[PDB]
């Protein structure tokens with residue numbers, strides 16, 4: 324299959340062309356969000372890290388419903404900024420907690436290929 328690497332320069336492009344099942348093939352977490360942070364895609368990998376049902380979180384807001392612990396300047400702050408600037412490509416470590424067992428992860432946010440969406444890539448560290 325296609326084993327896209329975390330941090331691939333053109334990761335967004337690749338994910339854009341993916342066909343059914345391909346996203347859940349990534350070894351790391353992948354979440355696609357709209358401008359307000361509403362979840363459009365959520366893969367198996369992320370669900371295995373968070374305990375969340377990928378189907379259930381769809382349509383829910385990432386920062387306000389599912390991942391409230393990311394509602395901070397360090398995460399949500401960077402997101403909104405990148406959204407308002409049309410430029411989003413940053414990497415930082417973060418601790419997921421509050422709605423899950425405290426877990427250290429490496430996060431990569433990047434604007435999507437075309438359209439108005441954004442990607443949040445996650446993997447445990």
Ligand SMILES: *C(=O)/C=C/c1ccc(O)cc1
Pocket residue numbers: 354369370373375389390391392393419420421422423
């Ligand atoms: C903070 O509350 C983190 C929670 C969280 C992050 C990412 C997910 O996919 C699900 C929950």
